[PDB]
Design a binder for these strands. Structure first.
Lengths: 225, 215
RNA sequence: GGAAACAGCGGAUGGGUAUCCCACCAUUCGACCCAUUGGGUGUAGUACUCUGGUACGAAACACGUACCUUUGUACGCCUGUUUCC
């Protein structure tokens, strides 16, 4: 019922600017404190800012004060975090969160947005190339063989991978992205399948790279011999 | 002025049914203004406990929290499989608010040896000019594992990269991909590309390999 | 007794005064309270203030309200002292 929908994340150059918004539904933010909390890739939660109800008093973390501005538009029932002079260490998933009602959940943050990823980098957006991980061309070792797709040299995160438009989900492993020395990410998605039916079955990995508006589909087959 | 929240342990591997105790020490008094959150990978955090010890509506009664001076503890009296997560404490006594650095909780299980696959590069990537050889380690426990690449028996170092999945939802295993990156020119200079694995579940190291250009 | 005025913590000592107490001063010497170049200290009384808090209001601050506390003003009350009548 209560929801917080964030938007406005993306890739920004150092020194640049970005506005996040947090659209509330099922409650009105004018009666609650709204907070922003971020989480660097692979790190913990880090509180960023909050805005108090009825007074509009604002609070900010040490590292972002004077660079970030938090606000609430009660007419639109939406909160904002305006981020100026971004640096690379500001790269994070950004959540907005509701501080609950004083009598019901103390000062716990009882509702959270889905998060929006902000990447601060000089690197330009770059779409990925998708290459197949070919099945075992030798006989069956264990009754089953493994196949997959390699998604290489993209920026920024994320890529999402599915198989047969999501009909095939059992046994898939999509690995975390690795940052190559080139400054671009790569990841692999693999599946294990019965080797007895490789050449008579359709295997399409569905690669989506939203930051570049890229969608790729790759059929996977063992080669000539 | 600033208040730090020191959370321990940073990680914990426990079995289903174990009592779990996570602690958080505030560097000065934060009265009772402490909350605990559960976060599963790729998800937003969920509130468990507020005001140091009050259970949030909807949260199972096996979760509890308590305060003694500046020490706050989260207890799960009987760890359940859906309780794998990272737990965070947070003080909201003063601004700026502070989170603890988190405790990642993972589930023990029996040793599982890895199943190994080797992957030669596709002809299409060869068109571009780089070669990616991939080694897949599938569904093993514990997490610790060793991959060494050999090319014509010559040991490789520093031209490989690894990636590990999170613990699986059902079987509580991991998977690992190791990618060997070489220029196409160096790929054609050598003949035998092999991937050798060491793990607790293997009495002897396992080797999957191929001969460059074997159709 | 009746007004009217002024005052209100404890020594000690001294002075006078009393000449016993008692009053009356000076001096030092304390004690307690408080918001400490200082100020307050009969009152379990009131009402305004102010100091600092507690709580709630969809409310960490601000705002509103209630209560508590402190400061200081009146007012009432008790005790004196003086002058009268």
């Amino acid at each position: 019922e209560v929801q917080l929908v964030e938007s406005g994340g993306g890739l920004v150059q150092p020194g640049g600017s970005l506005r996040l918004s947090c659209a509330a539904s099922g409650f009105y933010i004018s009666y609650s404190s709204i907070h922003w909390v971020r989480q660097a890739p692979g790190k913990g939660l880090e509180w960023v800012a909050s805005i108090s109800p009825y007074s509009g008093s604002t609070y900010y973390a040490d590292s972002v004060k004077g660079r970030f501005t938090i606000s609430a538009d009660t007419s639109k029932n939406t909160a904002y975090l305006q981020m100026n002079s971004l640096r690379a260490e500001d790269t994070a998933v950004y959540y907005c969160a509701r501080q609950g009602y004083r009598r019901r959940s103390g000062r716990g943050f009882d509702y959270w947005g889905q998060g929006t990823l902000v990447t601060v980098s000089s690197a330009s957006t770059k779409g990925p190339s998708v290459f197949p991980l070919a099945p075992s061309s030798k006989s069956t070792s264990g009754g089953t063989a493994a196949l997959g797709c390699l998604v290489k040299d993209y920026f920024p995160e994320p890529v999402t991978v599915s198989w047969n438009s999501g009909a095939l989900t059992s046994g898939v492993h999509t690995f975390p992205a690795v940052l190559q020395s080139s400054g671009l990410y790569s990841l692999s998605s693999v599946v294990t399948v019965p080797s007895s039916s490789l050449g008579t079955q359709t295997y399409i990995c569905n690669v989506n790279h939203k930051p570049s508006n890229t969608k790729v589909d790759k059929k996977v087959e063992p080669k000539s011999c | 002025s600033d208040i730090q929240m020191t959370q321990s342990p940073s990680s914990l591997s426990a079995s289903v049914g174990d009592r779990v105790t996570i602690t958080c020490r505030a560097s000065q008094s934060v009265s009772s203004a402490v909350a605990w959150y559960q976060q599963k990978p790729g998800k937003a955090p969920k509130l468990l406990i507020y005001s140091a010890s009050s259970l949030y509506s909807g949260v199972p009664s096996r979760f509890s929290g308590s305060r003694s001076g500046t020490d706050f503890t989260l207890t799960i009296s009987s760890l359940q499989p859906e309780d794998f997560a990272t737990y965070y404490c947070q003080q909201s006594y003063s601004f700026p608010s502070t989170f603890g650095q988190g405790t990642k909780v993972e589930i023990k299980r029996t040793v599982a040896a890895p199943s190994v696959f080797i992957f030669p590069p596709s002809d299409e990537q060869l068109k571009s000019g780089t070669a990616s050889v991939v080694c897949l380690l599938n569904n093993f426990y514990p997490r610790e594992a060793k991959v060494q690449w050999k090319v014509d028996n010559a040991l490789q170092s520093g031209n490989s990269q690894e990636s590990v999945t999170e613990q699986d939802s059902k079987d509580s295993t991991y998977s690992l991909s190791s990618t060997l990156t070489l220029s196409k020119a160096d790929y054609e200079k050598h003949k035998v590309y092999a991937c050798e694995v060491t793990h607790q579940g293997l009495s002897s190291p396992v080797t999957k390999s191929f001969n460059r250009g074997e159709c």
